Design a binder for this molecule. Structure first.
Ligand SMILES: CO[C@@]1(C(=O)Nc2cncc3ccc(F)cc23)CCOc2ccc(Cl)cc21
Ligand SMILES: CO[C@@]1(C(=O)Nc2cncc3ccc(F)cc23)CCOc2ccc(Cl)cc21
Ligand SMILES: [Cl-]
Lengths: 305, 302
């Protein structure tokens, strides 16, 4: 019993975190094989960030301008190239701790673990979801750039996020490991804002199934709904549309608890129109949307890595 | 910016998790140097659990009755001793991945990261606190026994908890790494129950200071309170008494925000009276009590 916001074990990722310094800017890099990946804005000064020409700024740098520190060992940079918003620093030494890995681009609603780092040193691990507005509600201070997001499937680490910036509302923006931003963001000091966010409907439903598995049933009712009626209601509360794929994905949880996906949608509909009425669900007074259906199955079954 | 429930990076602890098997019982062990620590109930059968005589059950076991698996490598048990509710299995190989570590016994209100494991394999990491009733609100299924709680301050892993039991309310009980249970719990299947739980007041105050540091001030008020008047109100909402030690501990956060501890206590009193009125504090509609003053400083400053 118990339901916690749980991150993947961060060990396989901790063995890849390095410090990257270029001039006065220090941030984090991900050392996989003989390449260190980091935000390309490490080459920029505060004045450069206003309007940077990254090819022009990069062509002026030599390998020795990048200081890469792996623990108390300085790695030697033997090449450098840019891929979208990520800088790839070729180093002489392959990381002996390189795990089996993939670079995956995730969709909004998908969750991942973030290993927050400062000066190439991991300080914390937390779980978060890629919001529908492509931001993440992370916890990052100055120097956290280059910290990464990941999922671990079997023994393979799928790197899905690299931290680049904080928006004025305190939320965060970054890229996949191929340097493509999630969202309409750019790595430039200019007016940028997170768009209107929505709630991840399939995730709230997954978390309602987690509450039922853990003995919380007060929100259940005799009612069912149609997918179309539920979406008409959901749109009204800034909830993402629920598709047939979401209903299919919730199938296993629907079979385990005996509550049909549209039966649980009628609970969610009632919760949106009437509130919790002083009650909580899994120790929360808000409907939680940062657990996917797969996270619920993994935690309520104990999958290991 | 941002305030998350943050766990410590679990890598240093993952390299210590082993599987311990004794007969039909399989659970987790913590391999540090040449010793594997695990709950002593690994020697029990489901029937032995009502009234086990651990010294009598242990004296019947030899080293080869304990199968210790570190990854795909079987370790050789060369000794065994019991220390309170922990079984210490001496093994013939020191863990090459043994980090710099300490065994620390924590007080209620303290937080730590849990590396939940099954069959010596880590499955997840989460943050939690030692409740005032000495239980932890963890996420543990059958086979999670032996999973550990820890903090990492600097490069040293301080092991503070080892999981042993799930109480009937779904909450969890365990020991420090010297085998002393937190709370009035015993490693027996006799009727046991978590005492009435309360909110960790100093932690809610720390989290209110975290909200102020992150720009949330809506809950502040022009009022102050005496420590005694605050406690009289706090007791009525099942909040732990706030001691002068707690007020002193909140000193740094008070100095950083410019809000006196007793002024923050007056905001809390008002929050308890009014609720949040549709508002949130750091993305939460409930008053959070699983962040200590130390956690707030660490996450907001460094
Ligand atoms: C690299 O610095 C920028 C940045 O957002 N940094 C930060 C990232 N995360 C957390 C932060 C917390 C506090 C803080 F002062 C800065 C943070 C701030 C300057 O403008 C820009 C413009 C574009 C880009 Cl892609 C990055 C940056
Ligand atoms: C060691 O087994 C006991 C136990 O609480 N196990 C569990 C621990 N954690 C999570 C669990 C989730 C589900 C479950 F069925 C059992 C769990 C089972 C009940 O009797 C006792 C009596 C005393 C002690 Cl110290 C332990 C135990
Ligand atoms: Cl303590």
């Amino acid at each position: 019993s118990g339901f916690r916001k749980m991150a993947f074990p961060s060990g396989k990722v901790e063995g890849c975190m390095v410090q990257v310094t270029c001039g006065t800017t220090t941030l984090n890099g991900l050392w996989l094989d003989d390449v260190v990946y980091c935000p390309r804005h490490v080459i920029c000064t505060s004045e450069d960030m206003l309007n940077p020409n990254y090819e022009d700024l990069l062509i002026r740098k030599s390998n020795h301008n990048f200081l890469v520190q792996a623990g108390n060992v300085q790695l030697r940079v033997i090449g450098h190239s840019m891929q979208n918003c990520v800088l790839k620093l070729k180093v002489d030494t392959a990381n002996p701790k390189t795990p089996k890995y993939k670079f995956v681009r995730i969709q909004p609603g998908q969750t991942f673990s973030v290993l927050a780092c400062y000066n190439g040193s991991p300080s914390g691990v937390y779980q978060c979801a890629m919001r529908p507005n492509f931001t993440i509600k992370g916890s990052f201070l100055n120097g956290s750039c280059g910290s990464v997001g990941f999922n671990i499937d079997y023994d393979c680490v799928s790197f899905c996020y690299m931290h680049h910036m904080e928006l004025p509302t305190g939320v965060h923006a970054g890229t996949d490991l191929e340097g493509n931003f999630y969202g309409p963001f750019v790595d430039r000091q200019t007016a940028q804002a997170a768009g209107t966010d929505t709630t991840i409907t399939v995730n709230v439903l997954a978390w309602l199934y987690a509450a039922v598995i853990n003995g919380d049933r007060w929100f259940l009712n005799r009612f069912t709904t149609t997918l179309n009626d539920f979406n008409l209601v959901a749109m009204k509360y800034n909830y993402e549309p629920l598709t047939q794929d979401h209903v299919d994905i919730l199938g296993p949880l629907s079979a385990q608890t005996g509550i049909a996906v549209l039966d649980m949608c009628a609970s969610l509909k009632e919760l949106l129109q009437n509130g919790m009425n002083g009650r909580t669900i899994l120790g929360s007074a808000l409907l939680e949307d940062e657990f996917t259906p797969f996270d619920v199955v993994r935690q309520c079954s104990g999958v290991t890595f």
